[PDB]
Amino acid sequence: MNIFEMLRIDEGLRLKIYKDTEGYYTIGIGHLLTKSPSLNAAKSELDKAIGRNCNGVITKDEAEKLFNQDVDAAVRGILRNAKLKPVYDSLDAVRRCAAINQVFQMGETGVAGFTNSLRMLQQKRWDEAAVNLAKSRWYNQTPNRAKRVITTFRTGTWDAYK
């Protein structure tokens, strides 16, 4: 297991434009296209991202290319964030994957506001952090995925990803 395999499990792979859990146009391995309700706007974003006229469909290679860009950008963002970086750097590699996963799903701003969870994680108070992480819209809206990510934070193992 690694961050790519983990997010591939949590996000799936779809080659045609679909709506994510929040109802937003998305493609590939959880690549958000736009929050606009206009499918044409999503198609425009897709074509811009891939560099050709896709008419709403991409290849597996293209999906994987976006995925690599998205994972890379998620990490680089964490490292640029004054609140997230010290916590991320305090973690072991497995828990770092859980951090990347959450930012990939939620975006960096939302996570940066998890002030109490962040403090507990930096303190390595793992059970307490796990309890705090679940007191969230995140957990309530996507509980099965959040449970996997939280178990990863709690244990520093890949047990939740079989």
Binding site for ligand 264 (CB under 6 A): 78, 84, 87-88, 99, 102-103, 111, 114, 117-118, 121
Beta carbon of residue 19, minimum distance to ligand 264 (angstroms, whole number): 25
Closest CB to ligand 264 among residues 58, 99:
99
4 is in an annotated binding site: no
153 is in an annotated binding site: no
Contacts of 154 (CB under 8 A, 6+ apart): 126, 127, 129, 130
Residue holding tokens 């990939």?
A: 104
**Dihedral angle over CA of 149, 66, 80, 1, nearest 10:** 30
Catalytic residues: 11, 20
Closest CB to ligand 264 among residues 41, 75:
75
CA atoms within 13 A on the CB side of 16: 0
Binding residues: 32, 104, 117, 132
